[PDB]
Design a protein around this motif. Sequence first.
Motif, PDB file in Angstrom:
ATOM      1  N   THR A 112       4.315 -15.705   0.984  1.00 17.97           N
ATOM      2  CA  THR A 112       3.870 -15.046   2.201  1.00 17.97           C
ATOM      3  C   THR A 112       3.503 -13.607   1.862  1.00 17.97           C
ATOM      4  O   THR A 112       3.876 -13.091   0.783  1.00 17.97           O
ATOM      5  N   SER A 113       2.761 -12.963   2.761  1.00 19.17           N
ATOM      6  CA  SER A 113       2.360 -11.576   2.598  1.00 19.17           C
ATOM      7  C   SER A 113       3.531 -10.625   2.762  1.00 19.17           C
ATOM      8  O   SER A 113       4.523 -10.935   3.430  1.00 19.17           O
ATOM      9  N   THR A 115       4.410  -7.156   4.486  1.00 25.73           N
ATOM     10  CA  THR A 115       3.871  -6.479   5.675  1.00 25.73           C
ATOM     11  C   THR A 115       4.616  -5.187   6.042  1.00 25.73           C
ATOM     12  O   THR A 115       4.452  -4.653   7.145  1.00 25.73           O
ATOM     13  N   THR A 128      -1.088   1.995   1.205  1.00 17.21           N
ATOM     14  CA  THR A 128      -1.540   0.680   1.643  1.00 17.21           C
ATOM     15  C   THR A 128      -1.004  -0.417   0.745  1.00 17.21           C
ATOM     16  O   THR A 128      -1.259  -0.414  -0.470  1.00 17.21           O
ATOM     17  N   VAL A 130      -1.477  -3.998  -0.429  1.00 16.56           N
ATOM     18  CA  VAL A 130      -2.576  -4.946  -0.527  1.00 16.56           C
ATOM     19  C   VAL A 130      -2.027  -6.249  -1.102  1.00 16.56           C
ATOM     20  O   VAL A 130      -1.529  -6.289  -2.233  1.00 16.56           O
ATOM     21  N   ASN A 131      -2.087  -7.302  -0.302  1.00 17.09           N
ATOM     22  CA  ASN A 131      -1.688  -8.618  -0.739  1.00 17.09           C
ATOM     23  C   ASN A 131      -2.820  -9.301  -1.480  1.00 17.09           C
ATOM     24  O   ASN A 131      -3.975  -8.891  -1.362  1.00 17.09           O
ATOM     25  N   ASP A 133      -4.118 -12.134  -0.945  1.00 17.57           N
ATOM     26  CA  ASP A 133      -5.042 -12.715   0.037  1.00 17.57           C
ATOM     27  C   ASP A 133      -5.809 -11.672   0.821  1.00 17.57           C
ATOM     28  O   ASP A 133      -6.568 -12.042   1.735  1.00 17.57           O
ATOM     29  N   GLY A 134      -5.646 -10.402   0.486  1.00 15.72           N
ATOM     30  CA  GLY A 134      -6.420  -9.337   1.104  1.00 15.72           C
ATOM     31  C   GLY A 134      -5.753  -8.659   2.283  1.00 15.72           C
ATOM     32  O   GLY A 134      -6.176  -7.585   2.695  1.00 15.72           O
ATOM     33  N   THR A 135      -4.705  -9.300   2.823  1.00 12.92           N
ATOM     34  CA  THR A 135      -3.926  -8.779   3.962  1.00 12.92           C
ATOM     35  C   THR A 135      -3.422  -7.373   3.605  1.00 12.92           C
ATOM     36  O   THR A 135      -2.884  -7.169   2.508  1.00 12.92           O
ATOM     37  N   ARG A 136      -3.594  -6.404   4.505  1.00 17.31           N
ATOM     38  CA  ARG A 136      -3.185  -5.042   4.239  1.00 17.31           C
ATOM     39  C   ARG A 136      -2.261  -4.521   5.306  1.00 17.31           C
ATOM     40  O   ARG A 136      -2.370  -4.900   6.481  1.00 17.31           O
ATOM     41  N   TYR A 137      -1.336  -3.675   4.878  1.00 14.08           N
ATOM     42  CA  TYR A 137      -0.463  -2.918   5.773  1.00 14.08           C
ATOM     43  C   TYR A 137      -0.456  -1.480   5.276  1.00 14.08           C
ATOM     44  O   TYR A 137      -0.177  -1.228   4.094  1.00 14.08           O
TER      45      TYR A 137
END
Length: 150
Positions: A112-113, A115, A128, A130-131, A133-137
């Motif tokens: 999972t990402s 977050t 930032t 960066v996962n 899969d591109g998911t960012r927090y």
Amino acid sequence: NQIDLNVTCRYAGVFHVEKNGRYSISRTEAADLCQAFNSTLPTMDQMKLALSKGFETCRYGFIEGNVVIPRIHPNAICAANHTGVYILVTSNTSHYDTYCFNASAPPEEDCTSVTDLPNSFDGPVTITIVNRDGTRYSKKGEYRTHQEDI
Ligand SMILES: CNC(=O)CCN1CCc2cccc(N)c2C1
């Protein structure tokens, strides 16, 4: 004033972090970075268990005591075709990626990402996560406690 932290899946709590996608973390910064993830530098035993659950990368990073690459499948351009936890022996240079260990993570593969950067402190840097899969927090803060690292 921005830092990207590229993070992997966790395997038995162990994950890999690259700063700005380039080898650029000192040993002191590595400890501070893991602390910001409420994590520690993994021991060799922790890394070996992670490897056994499916963890491999193609990047040098700090653990407690050594700089390593976990390898499952032999690849000529990753740790010179070795398998296991490959230990870097001879290098001129001091800056790598890092591994981190989160005891609260699931026991096996957790793809999972990420977050949150739960233990970052107040500061001016846009950080930032960066996962793969591109998911960012993103959040504003700091994690470096040593001046030579900033
Ligand atoms: C040989 N180079 C590599 O293996 C770099 C792998 N990087 C490539 C860049 C990237 C971006 C976001 C999350 C992750 N985990 C990664 C991993």
